[PDB]
Design a protein around this ligand. Structure first.
Ligand SMILES: CNC(=O)[C@H](Cc1ccc(C(F)(F)P(=O)(O)O)c(Br)c1)NS(C)(=O)=O
Ligand SMILES: [Cl-]
Ligand SMILES: [Cl-]
Ligand SMILES: [Cl-]
Length: 293
């Protein structure tokens, strides 16, 4: 049981040691396309790149590159697309990816500004009457409605392919209180948000992979996806979180950026497992503890 495992790690004080092991054992794959001179202005950070083997390709002749990776968890039967916070020049590319990959959900775990510095472009409309048009990729994006809670907001967006005039509803799940290299306020706060995403339908296997991003698309995004995947495994199945993280790190570098994020992943999975094992009351308990109202 990982509860027994957790307390022993806490007792030995070995979180930093385990985390450093994970970094050492993590896959090292080439990112040659990301590092092409022509793609320099498409990367938010020089030290964060998608692997060639798992990168998302835009369906365009000129340049198919976007800083985004397909994480395909075979046993858990879920795929995620992890990407950086879009740049002012890659917002069109971002929504092109969403369209082409047929995603119906976007999970945002950062703020556009944190500690007085920009971490992400304003890639979605904040007001109904100010829709966005992405001329380079011929897409239109409209805010239809929003549901604002204390620490997260769920937005209903309409994405239109202007070429075909087909439209799709995209749900935008914005976690607003998760700082860079930090952790969520509580396991309850995180899990209340995660299951909101789960219950929305956005993660349906009939849809394309959910798009998850923060600023770099590795720390907070990695934490989110690790916890979700482990919970999936606990239901389908003795879950080895280090092993699952190393598996995910085959698809994108640097997933989970601090030892404390690793520790939090344990806490979240342990607490979330209560719901998995059949205790109804725990979900409304999270909601109360999250103080979303
Ligand atoms: C150490 N590298 C950096 O700080 C940045 C890249 C980076 C990596 C990870 C994050 C994050 F963990 F917070 P995430 O949750 O994934 O957004 C951030 Br923010 C930034 N590179 S640097 C040294 O060029 O500025
Ligand atoms: Cl080039
Ligand atoms: Cl924001
Ligand atoms: Cl790392």
């Amino acid at each position: 049981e990982m509860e027994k495992e957790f307390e022993q790690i806490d007792k030995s004080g070995s979180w930093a040691a385990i985390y450093q092991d994970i970094r050492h054992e993590a896959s090292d794959f080439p990112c040659r396309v990301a590092k092409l001179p022509k793609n320099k202005n498409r990367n938010r950070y020089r030290d964060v790149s998608p692997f060639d083997h798992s990168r998302i390709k835009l369906h365009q002749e000129d340049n198919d590159y976007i800083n985004a990776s397909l994480i395909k968890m075979e046993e858990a039967q879920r795929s995620y697309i992890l990407t950086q916070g879009p740049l002012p020049n890659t917002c069109g590319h971002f929504w092109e990816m969403v369209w082409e990959q047929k995603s119906r959900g976007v999970v945002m775990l950062n703020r556009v500004m944190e500690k007085g510095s920009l971490k992400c472009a304003q890639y979605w409309p904040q007001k109904e009457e100010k829709e966005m048009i992405f001329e380079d990729t011929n897409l239109k994006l409209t805010l239809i409605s929003e549901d604002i809670k204390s620490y997260y907001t769920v937005r209903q967006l309409e994405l239109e392919n202007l070429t075909t005039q087909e439209t799709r509803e995209i749900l935008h799940f914005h976690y607003t209180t998760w700082p860079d290299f930090g952790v969520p306020e509580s396991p309850a706060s995180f899990l209340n948000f995660l299951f909101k995403v789960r219950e929305s339908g956005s993660l349906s296997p009939e849809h394309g992979p959910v798009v998850v991003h923060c600023s770099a698309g590795i720390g907070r995004s990695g934490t989110f996806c690790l916890a979700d995947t482990c919970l999936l495994l606990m239901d389908k199945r003795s879950v080895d979180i280090k092993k699952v993280l190393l598996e995910m790190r085959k698809f994108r570098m640097g997933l989970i950026q601090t030892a404390d994020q690793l520790r939090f992943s344990y806490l979240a999975v342990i607490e979330g497992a209560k719901f998995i094992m059949g205790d109804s009351s725990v979900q409304d308990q999270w909601k109360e503890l999250s103080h979303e109202d």
